[PDB]
Amino acid sequence: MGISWLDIYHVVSATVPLYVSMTLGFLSARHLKLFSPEQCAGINKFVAKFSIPLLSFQIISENNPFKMSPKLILSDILQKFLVVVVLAMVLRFWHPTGGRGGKLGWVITGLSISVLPNTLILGMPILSAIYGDEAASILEQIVVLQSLIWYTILLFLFELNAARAGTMKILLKAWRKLIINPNTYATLIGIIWATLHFRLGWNLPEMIDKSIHLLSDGGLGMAMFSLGLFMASQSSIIACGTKMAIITMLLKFVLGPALMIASAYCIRLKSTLFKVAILQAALPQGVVPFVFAKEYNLHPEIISTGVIFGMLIALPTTLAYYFLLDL
Amino acid sequence: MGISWLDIYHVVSATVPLYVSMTLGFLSARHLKLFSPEQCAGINKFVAKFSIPLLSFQIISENNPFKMSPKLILSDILQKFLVVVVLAMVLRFWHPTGGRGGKLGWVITGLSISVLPNTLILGMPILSAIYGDEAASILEQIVVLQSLIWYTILLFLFELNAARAGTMKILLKAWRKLIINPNTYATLIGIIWATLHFRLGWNLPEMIDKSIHLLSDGGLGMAMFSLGLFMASQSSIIACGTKMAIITMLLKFVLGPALMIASAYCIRLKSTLFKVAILQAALPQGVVPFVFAKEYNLHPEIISTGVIFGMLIALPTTLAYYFLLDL
Ligand SMILES: CCCCC/C=C\C/C=C\CCCCCCCC(=O)OC[C@H](COP(=O)([O-])OCC[N+](C)(C)C)OC(=O)CCCCCCC/C=C/C/C=C\CCCCC
Ligand SMILES: CCCCC/C=C\C/C=C\CCCCCCCC(=O)OC[C@H](COP(=O)([O-])OCC[N+](C)(C)C)OC(=O)CCCCCCC/C=C/C/C=C\CCCCC
Ligand SMILES: O=C(O)c1ccccc1C(=O)Nc1cccc2ccccc12
Ligand SMILES: O=C(O)c1ccccc1C(=O)Nc1cccc2ccccc12
């Protein structure tokens, strides 16, 4: 496998649908002037509460939880610990804005620009096309972590930052916020049902499965449409300027993949899992962190710029990493 | 073959998904109080402008236009002429409200409560489940005819009624209103591409087909969700009143199917096409007529009540007609 032009063409053909399903939303929100800002928020609200949860359930319910590789989980833990260590070290010698501010604020804006890629909508098709169906069952293990263990911790830290800017009270507030999250319930039920379907042999009734599919189908396309609407909402792609966009992208597409490579070497992962993990780490930034930043107002411009430009540059960077890892 | 409890169970299993995809929207708009009126309006706009056109294209491009049986088209013409004649006769004898309202206005109110059922969203799944895939290729003929000729004549009639309350000026205004419709463009390109595909042998490129599917997939589910939102919008199911609701249901589910039976007998249709036509005529009322009524303010209450109550009572009538025609 020399990465001939045929493979790159196949990846491009697999990724074009989810880019033309996004340019449509961008044009509708910006050029065609089809949706009002409140109307745009209506679509953005429906998708994140009906398609992302149902899509997450339909993606996580089709995996034997007992087959989850502990090595990949430990590699994820090690990566998201090393990134924290490096962020703490760098923030001790170079404040990004100069003027002193909450260190935890800059460590929470970090860990959202570095080690929380988009692994449901914009990250599943690309990796599946690049590495076939083998890699589609590996992201299905990292998505579970990102939805259960990492986003809950990020929410708790966001609440802590909002309060600081009793610990038990903060934990209780984070719990209340989490209980009303459709995605956490969807992924929890997905794993609980996958356990049953793979151990006891239970199968979803035709009615239930088809009802779930009706809304799950098109979840990727409409999620990309909503992401395009979000891009159209912003006045300019580079919200904070060149200085904080180059650094954002350098972090996301170097310190993430590089730290994942270091973690894999420490854990000594294997082929068909090392490359998948690295590409996952190299995926564009996720959206949920942007939602948290907007809700708690923690540098929304930086995270929005990172998300938008990383999503735009997904194909170049992802193809570059795919070519590099095959040497 | 025949009628038995297992067949009814299969029909119910095929229809339940598109009812639980609608109760979700109803609850989100009314009970859960999830969407503000502007947000639900935006969702409705998005679906009607992106999923209905794309779904129509993906449904009409598959069948062969050259296989369109002229007998079914002639039967549709005869039905929608007989309904006009009967409506004109009855209106002269007995005015519905007695307020000396415009006869043309009530005729336009008719021809939509009678002979314009929902054949894309709520008509294709039910009929396909009842009669397998044979009926799915017969509805597409009626679907394309309704989208092209009948929904253009109805638009022209609405414009004429609005002006009545120059003929060339009215035709020009109707043309302007028709041009901006995306559904008309989608249903036209559907045949323009099906002709090439079935005659010239051309096939959609993988990229184009997958891009179309991304948004077409789940179009039925989100269309039912939008229909549920619309149902939740209205304060009560029976808007105009009990008498008007009863008259609307009686018309839609007796005069439509009865006139279609008369037209089929006149044209002498055949088995596997007669029953499909009758059930199609017995489907619940369509939505586009409600959109026109709301835009031009032509008895929105009666049409909305008919649409909602037909959607709720779709199965008790479709199954009844299926049982009746199998004797
Ligand atoms: C606060 C205390 C009460 C907490 C809730 C209590 C109990 C658990 C709830 C439900 C049980 C069913 C499964 C979980 C669904 C959770 C749905 C959910 O979170 O409801 C609320 C959520 C809306 O969000 P919000 O409330 O923040 O609105 C805020 C709106 N404003 C900001 C404008 C005010 O609604 C949505 O997300 C829409 C629905 C999303 C559904 C996602 C799960 C999909 C699962 C499928 C599995 C199906 C079948 C399995 C069958 C197995 C056996 C055969
Ligand atoms: C008035 C003078 C200009 C008239 C138009 C001129 C030329 C024809 C246009 C386009 C050609 C491409 C195909 C047709 C697309 C038509 C799209 C359309 O109607 O744009 C407008 C429509 C939005 O409506 P509005 O503007 O009334 O909004 C008003 C909103 N407010 C009131 C708030 C301001 O946008 C939408 O619906 C969104 C897009 C819907 C797309 C539906 C068609 C899908 C087709 C698929 C076929 C694909 C591939 C085939 C490949 C073949 C070769 C291999
Ligand atoms: O993209 C992420 O951040 C992510 C990563 C792993 C698991 C889940 C998610 C996730 O909920 N995405 C999204 C949430 C809400 C709205 C979204 C709209 C578009 C794309 C992703 C969305
Ligand atoms: O349902 C109809 O009236 C119909 C019948 C035949 C062909 C097309 C249609 C049609 O455009 N429906 C719809 C239009 C706009 C929004 C809709 C939302 C939900 C369901 C149907 C819709």
Testing the interface with A: which of B12, B32, B45, B46 to mutate, by most A Cβ within 10 A?
Answer: B46
Under 8 Å between Cβ of B55 and B120: yes
- Which residues, 6 or more positions from B297, have their beta carbon under 8 angstroms from its beta carbon? none
Atom of ligand 4 nearest to the CA of B118: 1
User: Which CA distances in Å does A277 have to A36, A64, A146, A322, A323?
Assistant: 40, 19, 13, 11, 15
A288 in a labelled binding site: yes
How many angstroms separate the CA atoms of B295 and B77, rounded?
26
Under 8 Å between Cβ of B110 and B83: yes
Handedness of CA B40, A23, B291, B226 (dihedral sign): negative
How many angstroms separate the CA atoms of B217 and A285, rounded?
26
A228 touches chain B (CB under 8 A): no
A213 touches chain B (CB under 8 A): yes
Q: How far is A118 from chain B (nearest CA, A)?
A: 18
A296 in a labelled binding site: no
Contact A215 B207 (CB under 8 A): no
- Taking the centre of ligand 3 as the mean of its atom positions, its distance from the CA of residue A122, in whole angstroms, is 9
B39 touches chain A (CB under 8 A): yes
What is the separation, in whole angstroms, between the first and last Cα of chain A?
A: 10
Contact A215 B220 (CB under 8 A): no
Q: How far is A215 from chain B (nearest CA, A)?
A: 5
- Per-residue b or e along A140-153, where b marks 16 or more CB atoms closer than 10 Å to that residue's CB: bbbbbbbbbebbbe
- Domains contained in chain B, number: 1
Residue A132 lies in a domain: yes
How many angstroms separate the CA atoms of A80 and A115, rounded?
7
- Torsion, Cα A179 A180 A186 A191, to 10 degrees, reads -10
- Which residues, 6 or more positions from B27, have their beta carbon under 8 angstroms from its beta carbon? B232
User: Which CA distances in Å does A145 have to A70, A140, B52, B138?
Assistant: 12, 9, 36, 48
Residue of A nearest to B40 (CA): A42
Who among B18, B49, B210 is closest to A34 (CB)?
B49
CATH of residue A71's domain is 1.20.1530
- Which residues, 6 or more positions from A319, have their beta carbon under 8 angstroms from its beta carbon? A8, A11
CATH of residue B210's domain is 1.20.1530.20
Contact A213 B49 (CB under 8 A): no
Closest ligand (CA of B175): 2
How many angstroms separate the CA atoms of B294 and B23, rounded?
23
A37 touches chain B (CB under 8 A): no
Atom of ligand 1 nearest to the CA of A202: 54
Contact B38 A35 (CB under 8 A): no
A177 touches chain B (CB under 8 A): no
Contact A215 B218 (CB under 8 A): yes
Under 8 Å between Cβ of A282 and A256: yes
What resolution in Å is listed for this PDB structure?
3.4
B112: containing domain:
5-325
Contact A45 B39 (CB under 8 A): yes
Under 8 Å between Cβ of A35 and B45: yes
Is residue A83 helix, strand or coil?
A: helix
B265 in a labelled binding site: no
Nearest to B308 by CA among B242, B231, B222: B231
Q: How far is A45 from chain B (nearest CA, A)?
A: 8
Is residue B285 helix, strand or coil?
A: strand
- Which residues, 6 or more positions from B151, have their beta carbon under 8 angstroms from its beta carbon? B116, B183, B184, B288
How many angstroms separate the CA atoms of A256 and A113, rounded?
9
A215 in a labelled binding site: no
Q: Which of B22, B34, B38 to mutate to test the pocket of ligand 1 (most atoms within 8 A of CB)?
A: B34
Testing the interface with B: which of A11, A15, A39 to mutate, by most B Cβ within 10 A?
Answer: A39
- Torsion, Cα A144 A150 A154 A155, to 10 degrees, reads 40
